[PDB]
Amino acid sequence: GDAWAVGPVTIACLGALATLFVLGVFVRHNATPVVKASGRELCYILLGGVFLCYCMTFIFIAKPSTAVCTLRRLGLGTAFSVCYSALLTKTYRIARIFGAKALIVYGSTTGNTEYTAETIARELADAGYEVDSRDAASVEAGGLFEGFDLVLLGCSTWGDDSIELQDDFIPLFDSLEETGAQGRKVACFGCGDSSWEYFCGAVDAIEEKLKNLGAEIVQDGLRIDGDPRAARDDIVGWAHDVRGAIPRFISPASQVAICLALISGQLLIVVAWLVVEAPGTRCNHRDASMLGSLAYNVLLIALCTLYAFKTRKCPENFNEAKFIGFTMYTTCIIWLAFLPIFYVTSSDYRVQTTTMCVSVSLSGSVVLGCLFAPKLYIILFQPQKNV
Ligand SMILES: Cc1cc2nc3c(=O)[nH]c(=O)nc-3n(C[C@H](O)[C@H](O)[C@H](O)COP(=O)(O)O)c2cc1C
Ligand SMILES: C[C@@H]1c2nc(C(N)=O)cc(-c3ccc(F)cc3F)c2CCN1Cc1ccnn1C
Numbered sequence: 001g002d003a004w005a006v007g008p009v010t011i012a013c014l015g016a017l018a019t020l021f022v023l024g025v026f027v028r029h030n031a032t033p034v035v036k037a038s039g040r041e042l043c044y045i046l047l048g049g050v051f052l053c054y055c056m057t058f059i060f061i062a063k064p065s066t067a068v069c070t071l072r073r074l075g076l077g078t079a080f081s082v083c084y085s086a087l088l089t090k091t092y093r094i095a096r097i098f099g100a101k102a103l104i105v106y107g108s109t110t111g112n113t114e115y116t117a118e119t120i121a122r123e124l125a126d127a128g129y130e131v132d133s134r135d136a137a138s139v140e141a142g143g144l145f146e147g148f149d150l151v152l153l154g155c156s157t158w159g160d161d162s163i164e165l166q167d168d169f170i171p172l173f174d175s176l177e178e179t180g181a182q183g184r185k186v187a188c189f190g191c192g193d194s195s196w197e198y199f200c201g202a203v204d205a206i207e208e209k210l211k212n213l214g215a216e217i218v219q220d221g222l223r224i225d226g227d228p229r230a231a232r233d234d235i236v237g238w239a240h241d242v243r244g245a246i247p248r249f250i251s252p253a254s255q256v257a258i259c260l261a262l263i264s265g266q267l268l269i270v271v272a273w274l275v276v277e278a279p280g281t282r283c284n285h286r287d288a289s290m291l292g293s294l295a296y297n298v299l300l301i302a303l304c305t306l307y308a309f310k311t312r313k314c315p316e317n318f319n320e321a322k323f324i325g326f327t328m329y330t331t332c333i334i335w336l337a338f339l340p341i342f343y344v345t346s347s348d349y350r351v352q353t354t355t356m357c358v359s360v361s362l363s364g365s366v367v368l369g370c371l372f373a374p375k376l377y378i379i380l381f382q383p384q385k386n387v
Contacts, residue, residue: 004350005061008357012057015361015368019051022372029379034386037317038375039093041252042086045259046367049082053364057357069279077270077293078263079360083367084300085262087324091307092258093250094321098314100246101147102129106154107136107169107202112191113154116228116235120152120189123239128248136168144172145180149246150187150218153210155202157192163201173206182214185245188221189238191228199223218245266296282349301335304328318378318385320371327370334363 026043029035035043056079059071102124106117114135121131129150136155145151155173158164165173172179188207192200200223207221222238224231269292277285305328314321338359345351378385 002061004354008057008061008354008361011358011361012054015054015364016051018368019047019054019364022368022376023047023051025376025379029386032379032386034318034375034378038320039090039252039255041256042090042093042259045256046083046086046090046371049079049086050364050367052079052082053360055079056360060353060357064281064283066280069281069283069285070274072283073274073279073285073289073293074270076360077266077290077297080297080363081263081266081300083364084297084304085259085266087328087367088262088300088304088307089255089259091304091311091321091324093255094311094314094316094324095307096246096250097128097248098130098311098316100129100149100248102131102150102152103145103148104131104133104152104154105136105139105144105172106133107166107172108154108156108191109158109166110156112224112228113156113166113189116189116191116222116224116231117152117154119228119232119235120154120239120242123236124150124243127239127243129243136166136172139172141172141175142178143180145184148184150185150242152187152189152242153206154189155206156190157196157198157200157202159201163198163205165202165205169202169206173209176209176213181210184215185218186210186215187217187219187242187245189224190221191224191226194225199225218242262300266293269293269296298335301328301331305332318374323371323374327367330366330370331363334359334366 023044026035026047030040052075056075059068059075062068102121104117104121104124106113108114108117117133121133125131132148155169156166158166188203188210190200190203192202198204200221203221203223207217210217219238219242222235224235228235273285273289273292277289279285308321308325308328311321312325338355341355341359342352345355
């Protein structure tokens with residue numbers, strides 16, 4: 001009769017208990033770095049989603065009613081949508097910040113502008129950028145700026161009659177049209193001497209050509225007078241203002257906005273089909289009412305796995321990106337394995353519903369077991385690491 005529901009209900013109960021435990025430990029330690037650095041708000045939205053996956057079991061084991069059918073269609077897509085929107089936004093946050101790529105191309109004869117470049121690069125990698133420093137002799141003009149979020153061009157001033165660019169930088173300057181400059185966020189730097197009429201004339205020449213090319217000049221170029229080693233405060237100070245180009249911060253309020261929008265998209269699909277195809281009684285629409293709902297979640301997961309794989313090497317918040325990666329790879333394995341299972345068990349409603357319950361629970365279990373279990377281990381057993 002209802003013995004088929006012992007297995008699913010036991011799982012859902014233990015899973016809801018485990019989710020309330022994980023929430024509790026997180027809230028108890030809400031101000032500690034492990035809980036704050038991870039993009040806190042998103043982690044709460046995720047546990048809510050996971051708790052809902054376990055709650056789905058009760059709604060599927062309960063007797064079909066117009067309300068039960070509404071909630072079955074409403075909840076199944078939404079519960080998963082809450083999980084994967086939280087996971088996508090977390091990955092987007094990592095990608096947007098540690099994603100950003102900077103390129104520094106310097107021109108130096110005595111290595112002063114090279115030192116200034118070496119200081120800026122260290123500061124930017126510390127800021128979160130994936131810096132790529134190169135000398136103007138090594139660089140080839142064609143497609144040199146492509147795929148870089150930020151580009152810094154360093155060069156010294158020469159000439160014994162007028163402004164002259166550093167020798168390695170002249171071939172780059174003359175063929176700057178074929179570099180990818182238009183629309184690119186740029187900044188210039190260089191070393192000169194105030195004993196010369198045109199102090200850092202090279203910086204001026206490069207800034208003006210970039211303006212003409214259609215580049216986004218982020219800041220007034222850095223002009224180092226004399227020894228750059230004595231201007232470290234000026235050079236680091238400038239690199240601090242430069243780094244605030246591709247934003248290195250996403251507000252918790254903005255994180256919940258993106259997440260909430262991605263949930264809203266599924267809710268629009270699931271409500272739109274409840275309006276056209278009214279719920280009723282077994283449940284009236286067990287056909288292709290959840291097809292759109294499924295496509296939306298298949299998109300979210302695929303997107304999330306692609307971003308998670310791209311962000312896998314990021315060490316921030318105790319290698320979180322690695323564990324977000326693992327939860328997504330396991331989700332793909334689950335989803336791709338249960339798809340033929342639902343097809344072959346379509347003849348038996350009890351087996352079909354039991355499988356649905358087990359798999360929805362399993363999907364929720366890999367989020368707890370892969371993302372939260374390593375976080376809970378540091379919180380509860382390694383407190384010295386959480387301070
Ligand atoms: C012949 C010569 C011409 C220079 N012309 C200028 C100039 O017009 N304006 C300027 O501000 N500095 C000028 N300088 C100063 C250099 O740019 C300065 O020595 C700089 O620190 C060298 O940096 P680098 O090692 O990166 O090439 C000139 C230096 C020399 C030796
Ligand atoms: C198409 C729908 C569905 N929709 C979503 C979805 N909306 O994201 C997820 C799953 C699902 C995927 C992976 C897993 F492991 C467990 C799961 F439940 C399923 C499973 C079968 N189901 C049948 C159906 C049609 C109409 N009513 N129902 C109840």
